[PDB]
Amino acid sequence: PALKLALEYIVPCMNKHGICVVDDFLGKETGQQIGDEVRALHDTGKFTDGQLVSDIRGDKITWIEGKEPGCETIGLLMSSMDDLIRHCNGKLGSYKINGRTKAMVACYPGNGTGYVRHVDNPNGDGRCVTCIYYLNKDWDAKVSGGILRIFPEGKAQFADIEPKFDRLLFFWSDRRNPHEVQPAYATRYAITVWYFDADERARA
Ligand SMILES: Cn1ccnc1CN1CCC2(CC1)CCN(c1ccc(-c3ccccc3)cc1)C2=O
Numbered sequence: 001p002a003l004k005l006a007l008e009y010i011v012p013c014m015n016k017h018g019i020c021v022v023d024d025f026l027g028k029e030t031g032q033q034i035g036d037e038v039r040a041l042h043d044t045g046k047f048t049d050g051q052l053v054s055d056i057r058g059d060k061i062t063w064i065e066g067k068e069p070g071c072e073t074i075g076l077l078m079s080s081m082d083d084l085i086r087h088c089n090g091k092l093g094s095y096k097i098n099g100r101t102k103a104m105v106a107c108y109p110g111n112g113t114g115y116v117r118h119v120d121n122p123n124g125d126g127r128c129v130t131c132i133y134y135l136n137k138d139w140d141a142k143v144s145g146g147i148l149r150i151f152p153e154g155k156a157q158f159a160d161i162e163p164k165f166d167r168l169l170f171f172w173s174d175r176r177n178p179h180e181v182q183p184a185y186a187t188r189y190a191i192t193v194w195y196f197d198a199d200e201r202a203r204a
């Protein structure tokens with residue numbers, strides 16, 4: 001229920017906390033299909049070899065426009081993220097969201113790598129909202145790790161997000177939300193898109 005989710009949940013939660021989670025976003029049939037497509041990209045070698053950690057390598061990535069052969073349902077996910085944001089009108093902060101990046105599909109290989117603490121957009125590059133879709137069936141963070149931990153600015157607490165199947169996450173891309181991915185001991189997939197604020201971007 002896009003507009004309803006938008007108006008009753010995503011808008012008030014973002015404006016109050018700046019971090020929001022939607023479980024069971026596309027449902028398990030579409031979700032599995034996205035899973036399958038991401039796995040096919042992995043098995044057919046479309047991912048990079050992974051972030052040079054040490055040689056130990058971490059998260060493998062691939063940029064996905066949405067129209068590529070074999071990425072149709074990823075395309076569908078993207079269109080559906082786009083619908084959510086659009087049905088938010090201009091009510092996320094005072095931002096006017098007019099574009100987004102392609103989809104970054106990330107795959108942690110399960111070798112104990114994660115991702116160091118960072119801010120997605122620390123220097124005003126246009127990106128106002130980070131949108132992440134998780135695809136990991138029966139993820140148990142107690143056993144496989146890979147929690148996304150956010151450190152909201154000015155709070156003395158963590159916000160730990162499990163990379164659960166069919167979960168969608170929004171958070172502010174700027175310094176309000178430093179985050180890290182804790183070590184992952186199982187294959188962990190996520191798809192991220194960033195939304196641009198027209199003014200910040202016209203001006204980057
Ligand atoms: C893996 N993961 C989990 C949680 N956090 C992360 C890492 N997080 C921060 C670093 C990345 C990925 C996300 C590396 C790519 N990237 C990125 C850079 C530049 C642009 C860009 C530049 C110009 C014009 C338009 C877009 C878009 C995206 C990031 O921000």
Ligand code: NI
Nearest residue numbers: 118119120179
């Ligand atoms: Ni990040």
